[PDB]
Amino acid sequence: ARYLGPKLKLSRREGTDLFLKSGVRAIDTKCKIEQAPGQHGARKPRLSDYGVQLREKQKVRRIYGVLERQFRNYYKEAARLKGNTGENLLALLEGRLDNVVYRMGFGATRAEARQLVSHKAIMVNGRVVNIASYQVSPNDVVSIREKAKKQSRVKAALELAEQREKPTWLEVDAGKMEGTFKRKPERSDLSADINEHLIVELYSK
Amino acid sequence: KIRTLQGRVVSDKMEKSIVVAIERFVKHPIYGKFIKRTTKLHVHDENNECGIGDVVEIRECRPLSKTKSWTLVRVVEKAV
Amino acid sequence: ANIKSAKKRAIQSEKARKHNASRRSMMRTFIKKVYAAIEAGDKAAAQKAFNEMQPIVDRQAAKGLIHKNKAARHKANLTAQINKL
Amino acid sequence: MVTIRLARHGAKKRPFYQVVVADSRNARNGRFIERVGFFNPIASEKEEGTRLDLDRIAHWVGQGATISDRVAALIKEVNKA
RNA sequence: AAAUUGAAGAGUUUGAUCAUGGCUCAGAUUGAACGCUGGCGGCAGGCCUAACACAUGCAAGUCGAACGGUAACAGGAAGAAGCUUGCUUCUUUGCUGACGAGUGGCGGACGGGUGAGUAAUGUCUGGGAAACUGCCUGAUGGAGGGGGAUAACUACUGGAAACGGUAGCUAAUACCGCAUAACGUCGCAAGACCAAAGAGGGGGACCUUCGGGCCUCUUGCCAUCGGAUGUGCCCAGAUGGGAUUAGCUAGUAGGUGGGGUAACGGCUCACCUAGGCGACGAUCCCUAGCUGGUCUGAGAGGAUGACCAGCCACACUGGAACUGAGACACGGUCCAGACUCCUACGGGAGGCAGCAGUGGGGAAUAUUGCACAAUGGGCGCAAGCCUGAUGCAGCCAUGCCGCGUGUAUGAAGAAGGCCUUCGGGUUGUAAAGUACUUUCAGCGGGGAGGAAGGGAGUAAAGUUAAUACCUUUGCUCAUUGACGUUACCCGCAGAAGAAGCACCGGCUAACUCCGUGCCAGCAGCCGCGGUAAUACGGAGGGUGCAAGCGUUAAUCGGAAUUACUGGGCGUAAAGCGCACGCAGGCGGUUUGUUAAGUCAGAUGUGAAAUCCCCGGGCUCAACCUGGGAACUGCAUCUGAUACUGG
Ligand SMILES: [Mg+2]
Ligand SMILES: [Mg+2]
Ligand SMILES: [Mg+2]
Ligand SMILES: [Mg+2]
Ligand SMILES: [Mg+2]
Ligand SMILES: [Mg+2]
Ligand SMILES: [Mg+2]
Ligand SMILES: [Mg+2]
Ligand SMILES: [Mg+2]
Ligand SMILES: [Mg+2]
Ligand SMILES: [Mg+2]
Ligand SMILES: [Mg+2]
Ligand SMILES: [Mg+2]
Ligand SMILES: [Mg+2]
Ligand SMILES: [Mg+2]
Ligand SMILES: [Mg+2]
Ligand SMILES: [Mg+2]
Ligand SMILES: [Mg+2]
Ligand SMILES: [Mg+2]
Ligand SMILES: [Mg+2]
Ligand SMILES: [Mg+2]
Ligand SMILES: [Mg+2]
Ligand SMILES: [Mg+2]
Ligand SMILES: [Mg+2]
Ligand SMILES: [Mg+2]
Ligand SMILES: [Mg+2]
Ligand SMILES: [Mg+2]
Ligand SMILES: [Mg+2]
Ligand SMILES: [Mg+2]
Ligand SMILES: [Mg+2]
Ligand SMILES: [Mg+2]
Ligand SMILES: [Mg+2]
Ligand SMILES: [Mg+2]
Ligand SMILES: [Mg+2]
Ligand SMILES: [Mg+2]
Ligand SMILES: [Mg+2]
Ligand SMILES: [Mg+2]
Ligand SMILES: [Mg+2]
Ligand SMILES: [Mg+2]
Ligand SMILES: [Mg+2]
Ligand SMILES: [Mg+2]
Ligand SMILES: [Mg+2]
Ligand SMILES: [Mg+2]
Ligand SMILES: [Mg+2]
Ligand SMILES: [Mg+2]
Ligand SMILES: [Mg+2]
Ligand SMILES: [Mg+2]
Ligand SMILES: [Mg+2]
Ligand SMILES: [Mg+2]
Ligand SMILES: [Mg+2]
Numbered sequence A: 001a002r003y004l005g006p007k008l009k010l011s012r013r014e015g016t017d018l019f020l021k022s023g024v025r026a027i028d029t030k031c032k033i034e035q036a037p038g039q040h041g042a043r044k045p046r047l048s049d050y051g052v053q054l055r056e057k058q059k060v061r062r063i064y065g066v067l068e069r070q071f072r073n074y075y076k077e078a079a080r081l082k083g084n085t086g087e088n089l090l091a092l093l094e095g096r097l098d099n100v101v102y103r104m105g106f107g108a109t110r111a112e113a114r115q116l117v118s119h120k121a122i123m124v125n126g127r128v129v130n131i132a133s134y135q136v137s138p139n140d141v142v143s144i145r146e147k148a149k150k151q152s153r154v155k156a157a158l159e160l161a162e163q164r165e166k167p168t169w170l171e172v173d174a175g176k177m178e179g180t181f182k183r184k185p186e187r188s189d190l191s192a193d194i195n196e197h198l199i200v201e202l203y204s205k
Numbered sequence B: 001k002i003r004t005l006q007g008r009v010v011s012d013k014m015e016k017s018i019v020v021a022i023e024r025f026v027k028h029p030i031y032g033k034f035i036k037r038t039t040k041l042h043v044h045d046e047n048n049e050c051g052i053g054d055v056v057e058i059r060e061c062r063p064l065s066k067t068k069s070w071t072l073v074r075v076v077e078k079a080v
Numbered sequence C: 001a002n003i004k005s006a007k008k009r010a011i012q013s014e015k016a017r018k019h020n021a022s023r024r025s026m027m028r029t030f031i032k033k034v035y036a037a038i039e040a041g042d043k044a045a046a047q048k049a050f051n052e053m054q055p056i057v058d059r060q061a062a063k064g065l066i067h068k069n070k071a072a073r074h075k076a077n078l079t080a081q082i083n084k085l
Numbered sequence D: 001m002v003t004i005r006l007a008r009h010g011a012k013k014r015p016f017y018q019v020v021v022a023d024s025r026n027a028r029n030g031r032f033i034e035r036v037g038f039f040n041p042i043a044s045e046k047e048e049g050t051r052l053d054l055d056r057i058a059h060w061v062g063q064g065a066t067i068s069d070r071v072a073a074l075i076k077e078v079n080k081a
Numbered sequence E: 001a002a003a004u005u006g007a008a009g010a011g012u013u014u015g016a017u018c019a020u021g022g023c024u025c026a027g028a029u030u031g032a033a034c035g036c037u038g039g040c041g042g043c044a045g046g047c048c049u050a051a052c053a054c055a056u057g058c059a060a061g062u063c064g065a066a067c068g069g070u071a072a073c074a075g076g077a078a079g080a081a082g083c084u085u086g087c088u089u090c091u092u093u094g095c096u097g098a099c100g101a102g103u104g105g106c107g108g109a110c111g112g113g114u115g116a117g118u119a120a121u122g123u124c125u126g127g128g129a130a131a132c133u134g135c136c137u138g139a140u141g142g143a144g145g146g147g148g149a150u151a152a153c154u155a156c157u158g159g160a161a162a163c164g165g166u167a168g169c170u171a172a173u174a175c176c177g178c179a180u181a182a183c184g185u186c187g188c189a190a191g192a193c194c195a196a197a198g199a200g201g202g203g204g205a206c207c208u209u210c211g212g213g214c215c216u217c218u219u220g221c222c223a224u225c226g227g228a229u230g231u232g233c234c235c236a237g238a239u240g241g242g243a244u245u246a247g248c249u250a251g252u253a254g255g256u257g258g259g260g261u262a263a264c265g266g267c268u269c270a271c272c273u274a275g276g277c278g279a280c281g282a283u284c285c286c287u288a289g290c291u292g293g294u295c296u297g298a299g300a301g302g303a304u305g306a307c308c309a310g311c312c313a314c315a316c317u318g319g320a321a322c323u324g325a326g327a328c329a330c331g332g333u334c335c336a337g338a339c340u341c342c343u344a345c346g347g348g349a350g351g352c353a354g355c356a357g358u359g360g361g362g363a364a365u366a367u368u369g370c371a372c373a374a375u376g377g378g379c380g381c382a383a384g385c386c387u388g389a390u391g392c393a394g395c396c397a398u399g400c401c402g403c404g405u406g407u408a409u410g411a412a413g414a415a416g417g418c419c420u421u422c423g424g425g426u427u428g429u430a431a432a433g434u435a436c437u438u439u440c441a442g443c444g445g446g447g448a449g450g451a452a453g454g455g456a457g458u459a460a461a462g463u464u465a466a467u468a469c470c471u472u473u474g475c476u477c478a479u480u481g482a483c484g485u486u487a488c489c490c491g492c493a494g495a496a497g498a499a500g501c502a503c504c505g506g507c508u509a510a511c512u513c514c515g516u517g518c519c520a521g522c523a524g525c526c527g528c529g530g531u532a533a534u535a536c537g538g539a540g541g542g543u544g545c546a547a548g549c550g551u552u553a554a555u556c557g558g559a560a561u562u563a564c565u566g567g568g569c570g571u572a573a574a575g576c577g578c579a580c581g582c583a584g585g586c587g588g589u590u591u592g593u594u595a596a597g598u599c600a601g602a603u604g605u606g607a608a609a610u611c612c613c614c615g616g617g618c619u620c621a622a623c624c625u626g627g628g629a630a631c632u633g634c635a636u637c638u639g640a641u642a643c644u645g646g
Helices: A008-014 A049-064 A068-080 A086-092 A113-117 A152-161 C004-036 C046-051 C074-083 D069-080
Strands: B005-011 B017-024 B037-044 B055-060 B070-076 D003-011 D014-022 D037-039 D050-052
Touching (some): A068 A086, B017 B070, C004 C046, C046 C074
Antiparallel strands (some): B005 B055
8 A cells, every 4th residue: 555666766757856765865866867767768758738637646646655545535625625725735745644754854755754653653742643644733742752762763864854944834843853733834835846736637527 | 364275166066065176376396487287176065055167265174075175165256 | 823922812812702792792782672662663662771771881881892982872873863753 | 101211323332322202112223202412431531421401301201201221320420410 | 604616528420621410438336246366454335136935943021019829949847767866758738939830911013024016095295173092191089899600720531643522629900790970971951871909018006716907108900181102084285107098987976864983984885966087197008115315417407215214015825803002913813725744544734025044046145153241122019031123243355444565775787587770778776785663463461441220238318106118318348241362552573474457559648579460369439450560469668556456237427419507490300281270378558456476584394314514532534423504395474566467
């Protein structure tokens, strides 16, 4: 129930940097970055009108590590709720606990935060939350358990994630390893390289 | 206090009873037209005081016969 | 019969049918008498059997065999049928 | 009779009883007249595991309904508590 | 405050274009079947056809506080034991705990199953008058004195057996009279008449025939008028198709009376009229249980009625009735008919469409399991006893939902596979190695909640003669789990036990090589295949999905392709050959009245659940759950008079 394959292949076919790796070396210096995977690299995939919507839905799915039956549900909630639907689809994929671990930088990547959660180590508020697709509300003070404060590989990600862009809709404390999801994240605090309104038009056929 | 219904008579050749046409005004559930629809009732009356072509005002009571449950009160516009 | 509580209330049924047919044909006999004396004009000899027929319907009602309105349709048909001789 | 009794709903191993005022011929989950409260024995703290319309469970006993034993224990709980 | 926020097109007629018109695909969906494949868990779903036939257990019992009694258990006081000087007989003794058979009271009319019939006898919505109503509850009164049989038993007898027959003895809350009798029935009246039953727990001293009257409370009985509750009945709307079915009906339509059920009534007879339904679709033929809802749809609409729940109908087919408050009765009764099984040939017995289960049909649907521990239900004052309803278990990927099969570094771009302009590109940072983590399964350890009550006491108080018994009220004591080696946390070990499927010509995301060469073959439409095939068959790479993936069956959408919202008729399918015309649809213009259409408000009803909005609880979701809008309707009383009808 997760993509177990190679990961630079999925950065390659989407043709962008989707942060599937750490940052210890850049994406360019580990593989070719424009060329599409397969025999037919350098045949540049200039593709149809439906294809530019499909390669836009798959980018925002493959960022977070969702499968399509979960993602269709995440669309239906964001058509049900009030407000917009781009600005209510990009809220639910940021409220996941497997993503508020990573945006606070308790883990190096987006598919390690799933292991830190789903190996029973990330207690929201004072009870362990094993299940990775939790819907973290505002003000929940997510911390790190004391069995997994002593890991080298969580502070190794702390020193890594202090060097990226720090977010605005969060408040991490460094030494105690304890976050605070403050408010719900706005539109432009999640980067606008996601063409937002091409995930609406697929499912709204 | 009582719930009468007007109507018009059709057949009163039988003894001590008339039959009354009542003319309700339905609206068709789809096409939006305003049709007429009629219902035919038996009306018991004593004294046999009604004929064809006459406007009566009936009211509901216990079943006097097999297919009959209505007795009249008055005969307005008594003639053709 | 397969259940003991069906056998027992199968033989508590004839023991009630025999009595409920005796004490009902008694009543129908005593109404047949006040219908025998009802076309022969005996206003002083139909009234006798009607006064013999007051308690033997107003008792078989109260012991639960007919209902009280059957015990009061008789005594308002026969009273008119007697007093209009 | 007519009687005030529980009637079980909810999910397996986690019950949730409503109370009903219904005819004691009829079934458990079946027909009733006035659904007048509930009883949630797997409630949490600071939420309400009982809520009984004690006006209606008086007006429906003055017209003669035998309150069954669990509803009687519920009234004994919530009136004193 | 919120309860909504909702609409996509493409291919195909011609050398080619526009137009009309079909056919086909994209998406959602399931009581689902089949193929390839398979780790776990949570909550729901599982004979759609043969209403076919059924072996085997099991699903309706209780009450000794209604009564005779002892068929056994086990204590008693006897006392005849071998007498051991203490006891381990047993007839006998119902005196006690209780209790096999039988009389009686209440329950089997509930709960449980299926949809054969049923086009209005049903169902849904809203109105009514002429009715009964066990248990529960309120008020006012009663509750005297007699009686006859009879099962159980005993004796004798028939029959293969089922089941009887005869003659004796015995009781009550079973059964029947007399008395009594009103606020009830009958009656304009005077008057006439109608019921019943006890038991139990305690008792001071008065009676005390040794049982008890006597006092006390608890519950039980009878009668009337009331309340709820369930049911019977009636009327106007609505609930498939057909006109290549256009005429049906004699108890049929109405009346006067007799009879009849609880009540009205052609409900059933006896007479007198000649009527009733029908083009707003009667009769007849085909098909079907309906509704809350469900799936789709932007909506209006179209199809459907499984699980949950309200109503009706049915119980081997075809009938009729008894008991009873309630049935014309699933696990009752008699009568035929078909089919099974026993028989001594005379005669008998049975009805899974209750939970399980075998045969059979079929593409296809489970275990002959545990427990009354909860919530219900029957009897019981109570304890307790029964409960295949229900609560949980077993099997199945059948559906919805969650998690896992590692995470991070890692370039010598390893080997091997394939492509190749013979330089290289590609699998591919993927594997290896190097460090890191242990959810789930695996072995251990601890341990929530579903459990309220009931019991044995003690304290006062309410009662009465009573400091008794009892009833409610505060406490103290030992207490009661089917699931259950439970949900759930903490320990041990090690990347170990956990990835498959469809497609790659266009529509539609993904391209090359070899092996066949109008053959073998694919196909949802257009088309491919005749030696360079991006379509057939293999491999390499690739894309979409994931404990699923695909193909067929079915509905809806796209289909504005049955169009009210929303289409056409000179040539594409389409204007009767032309007229006169009753039923039907529509009606210039002004004042006045009426309130039917219409419009506003209010009460009554539209059951719960589900859909939707804000909230709460199981680590989140599914699932569960509180309150409210919704249920576009329908009836009643008020109002309004512009338009339409009179
Ligand atoms: Mg899934
Ligand atoms: Mg009786
Ligand atoms: Mg009469
Ligand atoms: Mg508790
Ligand atoms: Mg929106
Ligand atoms: Mg076309
Ligand atoms: Mg062509
Ligand atoms: Mg297999
Ligand atoms: Mg059968
Ligand atoms: Mg058998
Ligand atoms: Mg016994
Ligand atoms: Mg029965
Ligand atoms: Mg049928
Ligand atoms: Mg009864
Ligand atoms: Mg008696
Ligand atoms: Mg008397
Ligand atoms: Mg008559
Ligand atoms: Mg029936
Ligand atoms: Mg039958
Ligand atoms: Mg009877
Ligand atoms: Mg049976
Ligand atoms: Mg018989
Ligand atoms: Mg069965
Ligand atoms: Mg079989
Ligand atoms: Mg077969
Ligand atoms: Mg088996
Ligand atoms: Mg139980
Ligand atoms: Mg049993
Ligand atoms: Mg499963
Ligand atoms: Mg190589
Ligand atoms: Mg484990
Ligand atoms: Mg417990
Ligand atoms: Mg393929
Ligand atoms: Mg393409
Ligand atoms: Mg193919
Ligand atoms: Mg060739
Ligand atoms: Mg070739
Ligand atoms: Mg193809
Ligand atoms: Mg449409
Ligand atoms: Mg349409
Ligand atoms: Mg179609
Ligand atoms: Mg057209
Ligand atoms: Mg033409
Ligand atoms: Mg012409
Ligand atoms: Mg003309
Ligand atoms: Mg006009
Ligand atoms: Mg009006
Ligand atoms: Mg509702
Ligand atoms: Mg919540
Ligand atoms: Mg007008």
